[PDB]
């Protein structure tokens, strides 16, 4: 949330917003197109990412997956999977719309 960008805040129209490592949110497709928008260099540092219509636990799983995938891609480990609950996958699949991954 602070303009020194290693913590970025992101909101889903829910009370439970989430603030995450930008370096561990680096694998987002849309971090290159709505924080790295028409011009870089302090467009990113605003850290008001006001997404809509996502329940809190869903994007908690999504951004925990962000940290998960960033530190489990190009590391010494490549095997592990992601244990999502079966029902929430549906609404998590709409998160699959947003983040281009």
């Amino acid at each position: 949330e602070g303009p020194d960008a290693m913590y970025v805040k992101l909101i889903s129209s829910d009370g439970h917003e989430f603030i995450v490592k930008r370096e561990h949110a680096l694998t987002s497709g849309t971090i290159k197109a709505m924080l790295s928008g028409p011009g870089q260099f302090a467009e990113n540092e605003t850290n008001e990412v006001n997404f809509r219509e996502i329940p809190s636990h869903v994007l908690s799983k999504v951004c925990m997956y962000f940290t998960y995938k960033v530190r489990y891609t190009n590391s010494s480990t490549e095997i592990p999977e992601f244990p999502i609950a079966p029902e929430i996958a549906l609404e998590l699949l709409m998160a699959a719309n947003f983040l281009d991954c």
């Binding site: 602070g2 020194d4 913590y7 439970h16 917003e17 989430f18 603030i19 490592k21 561990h24 951004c63």
Partner: peptide, 26 residues
């Protein structure tokens, strides 16, 4: 409740350094 911080650290670090790394940005 309604604000959740993310952290990354190792298996041994003083527990108020967590407060320091919250303090740095928040």
């Amino acid at each position: 409740h309604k604000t959740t911080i993310f952290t990354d650290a190792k298996e041994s670090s003083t527990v108020f350094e967590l407060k320091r790394i919250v303090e740095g940005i928040l």
